[PDB]
Design an enzyme around this catalytic site. Structure first.
Site, mmCIF file in Angstrom:
data_model
loop_
_atom_site.group_PDB
_atom_site.id
_atom_site.type_symbol
_atom_site.label_atom_id
_atom_site.label_comp_id
_atom_site.label_asym_id
_atom_site.label_seq_id
_atom_site.Cartn_x
_atom_site.Cartn_y
_atom_site.Cartn_z
ATOM 1 N N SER A 1 0.800 -1.216 0.000
ATOM 2 C CA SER A 1 0.000 0.000 0.000
ATOM 3 C C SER A 1 0.838 1.273 0.000
ATOM 4 O O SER A 1 0.277 2.357 -0.181
ATOM 5 C CB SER A 1 -0.968 -0.004 1.185
ATOM 6 O OG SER A 1 -2.084 -0.813 0.896
ATOM 7 N N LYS B 1 0.097 3.386 -2.965
ATOM 8 C CA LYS B 1 -1.154 4.124 -3.140
ATOM 9 C C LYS B 1 -0.938 5.610 -3.402
ATOM 10 O O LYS B 1 -1.535 6.129 -4.361
ATOM 11 C CB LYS B 1 -2.074 3.900 -1.934
ATOM 12 C CG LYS B 1 -2.777 2.547 -1.886
ATOM 13 C CD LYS B 1 -3.398 2.333 -0.524
ATOM 14 C CE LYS B 1 -4.413 1.168 -0.501
ATOM 15 N NZ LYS B 1 -4.015 -0.008 -1.330
ATOM 16 N N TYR C 1 -4.256 -3.753 -10.216
ATOM 17 C CA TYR C 1 -4.092 -3.385 -8.812
ATOM 18 C C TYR C 1 -3.180 -4.350 -8.053
ATOM 19 O O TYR C 1 -2.308 -3.921 -7.290
ATOM 20 C CB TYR C 1 -5.464 -3.324 -8.142
ATOM 21 C CG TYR C 1 -5.410 -3.095 -6.650
ATOM 22 C CD1 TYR C 1 -5.304 -1.813 -6.130
ATOM 23 C CD2 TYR C 1 -5.473 -4.157 -5.759
ATOM 24 C CE1 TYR C 1 -5.254 -1.595 -4.758
ATOM 25 C CE2 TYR C 1 -5.424 -3.952 -4.398
ATOM 26 C CZ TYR C 1 -5.314 -2.666 -3.900
ATOM 27 O OH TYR C 1 -5.268 -2.452 -2.542
ATOM 28 N N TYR D 1 -3.570 3.861 8.234
ATOM 29 C CA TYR D 1 -4.644 2.944 8.647
ATOM 30 C C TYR D 1 -5.366 3.592 9.834
ATOM 31 O O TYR D 1 -5.599 4.808 9.816
ATOM 32 C CB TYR D 1 -4.053 1.565 8.901
ATOM 33 C CG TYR D 1 -3.356 0.922 7.708
ATOM 34 C CD1 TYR D 1 -3.971 0.846 6.465
ATOM 35 C CD2 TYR D 1 -2.085 0.364 7.840
ATOM 36 C CE1 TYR D 1 -3.325 0.246 5.385
ATOM 37 C CE2 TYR D 1 -1.438 -0.232 6.768
ATOM 38 C CZ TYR D 1 -2.063 -0.289 5.545
ATOM 39 O OH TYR D 1 -1.423 -0.905 4.485
ATOM 40 N N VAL E 1 2.058 -3.403 4.114
ATOM 41 C CA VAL E 1 2.059 -4.614 4.926
ATOM 42 C C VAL E 1 3.382 -5.365 4.837
ATOM 43 O O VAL E 1 3.642 -6.262 5.642
ATOM 44 C CB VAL E 1 0.822 -5.431 4.495
ATOM 45 C CG1 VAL E 1 0.964 -5.917 3.064
ATOM 46 C CG2 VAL E 1 0.531 -6.586 5.459
#
Ligand SMILES: O=C(Cc1cccc(OC(F)(F)F)c1)Nc1ccc(CCCCc2nnc(NC(=O)Cc3ccccn3)s2)nn1
Ligand SMILES: O=C(Cc1cccc(OC(F)(F)F)c1)Nc1ccc(CCCCc2nnc(NC(=O)Cc3ccccn3)s2)nn1
Lengths: 410, 404, 402, 404
Positions: free
Chosen positions: C142, C145, C270, C322, C340
């Site tokens: 992530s 992103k 993705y 998060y 992660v």
């Protein structure tokens, strides 16, 4: 041929004459009490007869006709097994077993947030039944007074619907359960309290009863109303509980101000006085026996089964039973409706007002509560009662497997 | 004694012999249909006797007895007004007025092909008395009306405790009509799509989908007394090309491990779309509802189809969850367990009295048939059928279980 | 007086010639690397003259001039202490102590390695520092992103991107919903928002070209340092992506994609973008591009528009970590993004970019050690978004000397 | 060489003397006001020298030096263009354009009419340079603009970890903008009413509320460099007669035990109403904002007023929670910490540059001054003040920190 006449040969199995005690003992096994208000003429005439004729003590044919003729219809239904539970003695033995089973369940915590309820022993346990025909049974601590608390919520909702109608009442309060996430919210999306059985909704219902008179008369109006629902058995008041409920009621005050701000009350409401009135209604006292008669009025379409008096409109009783079904047991409401399928209301003092429509009303009382606020032994008793008898809302009256049906059978 | 002879004169005006048409007419006013499966022997025996001649034919006490003795218990109940609605002819006039009043309710939108003017109502009492008005033999898909039926099957075969390990037993409340799972990571109840999808996964595990559909079809046949059940492959194709939300549901349920071990999620969805495309009529569906009104016994066959546990549970979740966002309003005002579907069906149960199916494709904004909803309200305004009506004190409501 | 002349005298200081190693040692102490792409011409001619006379190795003034004349501007900023962090050697000592301090926090759990831990720095002027396991490749996850959101805003503008995605966090309690109240994902940093963003980039070409386009974009942000790919991670993410397939279908159903979108293909793309690989060193240059208004600091190349970089830093601030985003914004006040695999992409606006990497994650999904390092960095230095540059108590300010 | 004479020649050019007015004109164009508290000694010395003769009137190198010696460091900074915005006359011209552009935005409602509506904007840089346009000396109540100020006081006196035992540090999210408490049974942050009610209960515990009010006023005087701070009893009565929602919040906080021990909830609410009714002008509030812009040092007096921890925490929560339901959109597009109030004010901080107050009573449907929000958008469209603008590469925005 004559009804007093026929009834007469029924109880005189053979002899020409009936012992008074033999008539009474046969009368008690119907389930009726000799003190039943619909039986007073016959009971006075019987007591009188024991005075004016100490010689028997026994009843010839026109003598017994003289006593029972005024209450003859009721006495006939009772003795021709026409009551809603014909073998009431067998039924009460089951109730007693259910009672004893629940007595072994010793868990739960007594409400302790005010000292008027931390005094109540955790070992009081009482269950009272009153059928739609006025048949009575009690076991355990059924004459100890305790406060209705939230058990009063459907009773005052029923009163408001009876005086004002469904449509007016539900401009002010919704008619469905919150959902278990909306536990903590005061108002639904339409800025109305979710239903009459949550504190916020009961506070608004309280605000519609007898608008324009002052609180003293409002209270007397409601107390008169509970008297009739209870067939004039014990309805009292606990000032001690009212004082403590009013000094530790921050969240109800939080509710009252939010409702005022969101304009939830009728024009001209004194919100602080409505809060005072609300605490009073929570502190009204009953016993198991008198409250069970209140439940039976709800079971009986608005007629008090021990007086024959019409107390509430069918509309008021139907609405009330609907919301007890779906909102009456706090967060356990959905589980309770699923597994028990009976309209019920619990309160923090340990009462569970309970209605088996067309059959009977009950009050179960044991002070210790589970995490959701429901009496542990009442909850256990209610599951058992429906495991045993086909009283679940969606049990079938013709095909019900191994369940017992006390409305039937040899 | 004289059980069949007592019937003979009750119908024959103290008179020699009964014309057959007069016995048939007398039997239709009970509400039973001559095709009632429990009346087969009797009807067979009439067809044999009608074949002897081409005349009346007319039956003497002896001939009458030979036709009716096999079905005598049912026929006497019918003719001595023992059925749950003794004056059924009067009752159907009321149903007919209710039907015509709802016919004037023109609003709603059809989901999207059917015509917006179809409107049918069918009744089947717990004793097998039948009545229909409107478009009651036109097949249409159950869609979500099937959800109680397959939940019943699953509880019937596995028990309540096992089934509710995978699905909840309460309505969500008006705001979480959009969430897939409740706080315990279970679908809220089997009347929502997420919950019906999980329930679909429990039925006849291990066996493949083709046999699973067969089992359900047979189960629905029992439920309908073998009246019309079918399948719309066109609906099934349409439902599956546009089941995006159902696939979103399926993948989320898979990730949260909501299914029994060994489940093929993509196959379950296919099976789920099949169950939604099952076809019925108002008449056949009304028999299914009567099975639910009658404790699990099909009223026109006498067969036990579901356990009472299954029916009770099913009737409970239909009460609180079966009319989508209108469930709470419907419970409060109608007090009857019901299940609607997007084709315009409302499956309706009056416990211990009768089952009904109403069908009119135009839906309101909540997804319920406009005319069915109107009809349901009127039905309970008229008769003391609300679940918390009192059976003894009901004001000016009509009670069809009583006479006079 | 010529500029290479005066720069010559400052380094020459005493004698009449500068040993090359003396020049190079003085150059690295600025924090530049010899391999810097803006120093290639100077380094090539230095290598050339070490051939062209294998003696000395001398280096007089005219020789110095012809070596460094091509890169004289940057070499002067470097030697005149003109970089954002002038005393770079003192700062790197501080980075090292923070590294060693975070190194003894051994809690957390890998994503299903607990001893890999590295930290890389790249300033807005190209000064580099690394400590620990900083050349080990790992997937962005992530952390990709904000990079692909920046790519999309750069090619498409803020108006277009944000008909399709929201701009705010929304709730530690709506952290489980896919859509906000306007039926758009909440922001580009949540999976459903990152899925929609993916569907906007380079529309109307096949997935292989979309991928190459983004990898070429990441190459420029990283100054052509390591950007790679992990098919192993790709096949894994693709088999265990039930949650994201559940998001893809809900998005399709509620018409969240641009017309003509192949949702299952978008999910594959993705998964590909989550599997792209970096090191701490190359990722730090990416962060430093974000810190430098969209110019790659080690190449001077313009990679992203100011608009794209500003929007990205704003959403990293509030949606970056998060459920720890609110607490991180408060206590750290730096734009950051975690993933992660254990990476934390970190931007100190106008100063530097960093990448921290330690695989073990805390219960919110953030690298335990990275989080501890980020708190400690702000406790020590006045880098918090809402620290004051003039009055800052006991904190140190590495943009200063005396 | 001497700093004072170096300044003398610059002001004078190459002339004998500096006419007094020419030094005043030269000083005002730096942005400093002649009333600046840090320039008092120099102004007292021109006051004395101006009483020594009628229309003299000029200053020799020796006289000038006599006036400017006590404030030479700060006058040097001003005259050698070292202030955070060196070309300040150019910048205020831009503030004036922005002001006139927002002036044309006539929409909104105030929280019958007799006079136009008011609109004022004041700037105070971190160096004390001042500029004002519009209705900047009209007193108005802070209302919720006081929330960051009293949160800063409390963090200043008690610390971060004590204050945040009682109040949270995050925004709630648009869909919990109606709850009083987060999941930890604490208000979400200090910028919501429930949070500011609790922050109010932390300040100066163990004195009565008349002394608590005095203390906050003294603290607000320090923040404003002793410019205008006052109190509106009118607003105070109206706010307290109409505080049912705040009483509902107060009772819920009490029930849930959110206050520090020994708290009189009903009194805290009365204190809370007072603090909402404190009066400022645009000019004096801008100094308050400038103190927040300058690490807690009042820019026109040099006094340390708040700890850096207080100011940092306060700016962080203004960023995310400061503009009601527009906080998220405002943070994204404007990127400045700010706090709005229902009287029409917007306290605006540009960290390390300046503080501002914009005041225009008509509010949008979210509760924010229409004109103030328009101005704030235009300001960051024009200048590279956004928290995540780059100070080196910034497109064709203007940077008023730079020369020309
Ligand atoms: O207790 C907590 C932790 C918490 C946090 C967040 C989520 C959460 O999840 C859970 F709800 F499931 F528990 C729990 N919070 C809390 C709980 C209670 C309170 C006092 C509440 C007073 C204010 C209100 N009362 N009723 C309202 N009704 C509506 O707004 C109706 C509506 C619904 C949808 C759309 C539009 N309108 S507002 N204030 N705050
Ligand atoms: O629906 C919305 C905005 C919204 C609002 C109000 C009005 C509105 O208007 C409009 F929809 F009409 F536009 C929109 N968002 C949305 C709605 C649905 C989805 C798919 C959701 C799938 C993920 C989940 N399913 N169940 C869950 N439950 C739990 O996890 C436990 C928990 C915590 C909290 C609440 C209940 N449960 S999570 N994802 N996002």
């Amino acid at each position: 041929p004559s009804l007093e006449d026929l009834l007469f040969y029924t109880i005189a199995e053979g002899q020409e004459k009936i012992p008074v005690h033999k008539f009474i003992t046969a009368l008690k096994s119907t389930g009726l009490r000799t003190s039943d208000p619909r039986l007073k003429e016959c009971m006075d005439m019987l007591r009188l007869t024991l005075q004016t004729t100490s010689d028997g003590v026994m009843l010839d044919k026109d003598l017994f006709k003289k006593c029972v003729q005024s209450n003859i219809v009721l006495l006939t239904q009772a003795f021709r097994r026409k009551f809603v539970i014909p073998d009431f003695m067998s039924f009460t033995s089951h109730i007693d077993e259910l009672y004893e089973s629940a007595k072994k369940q010793s868990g739960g915590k007594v409400a302790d947030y005010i000292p008027q309820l931390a005094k109540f022993s955790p070992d009081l346990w009482g269950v009272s039944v009153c059928t739609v025909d006025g048949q009575r049974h009690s076991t355990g601590d059924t004459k100890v007074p305790f406060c209705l608390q939230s058990c009063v919520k459907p009773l005052k909702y029923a009163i408001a619907v009876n005086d004002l109608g469904t449509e007016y009442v539900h401009r002010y309060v919704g008619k469905e359960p919150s959902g278990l996430r909306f536990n903590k919210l005061f108002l639904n999306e339409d800025d109305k309290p979710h239903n009459p059985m949550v504190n916020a909704g009961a506070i608004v219902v309280t605000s519609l009863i007898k608008q324009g008179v002052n609180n003293a008369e409002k209270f007397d109006y409601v107390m008169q109303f509970l008297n009739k629902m209870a067939g004039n058995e014990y309805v009292g008041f606990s000032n001690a509980t009212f004082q403590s409920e009013r000094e530790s009621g921050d969240r109800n005050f939080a509710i009252g101000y939010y409702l005022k701000e969101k304009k939830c009350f009728p024009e001209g409401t004194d919100m602080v006085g409505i809060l005072d009135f609300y605490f009073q209604l929570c502190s009204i006292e009953v016993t198991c026996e008198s409250a069970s008669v209140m439940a039976a009025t709800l079971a009986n379409g608005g007629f008090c089964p021990i007086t024959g008096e019409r107390v509430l409109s069918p509309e008021a009783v139907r609405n009330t039973l609907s919301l007890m079904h779906s909102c009456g047991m706090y967060d356990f409401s959905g589980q309770f409706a699923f597994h028990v399928g009976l309209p019920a209301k619990s309160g923090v003092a340990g009462g569970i007002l309970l209605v088996v429509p067309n059959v009977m009303g009950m009050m179960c009382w044991s002070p210790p509560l589970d995490k959701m606020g429901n009496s542990v032994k009442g909850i256990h008793f209610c599951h058992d009662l429906v495991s045993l008898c086909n009283f679940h809302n969606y049990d079938n009256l013709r095909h019900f497997a191994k369940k017992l049906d006390p409305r039937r059978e040899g």
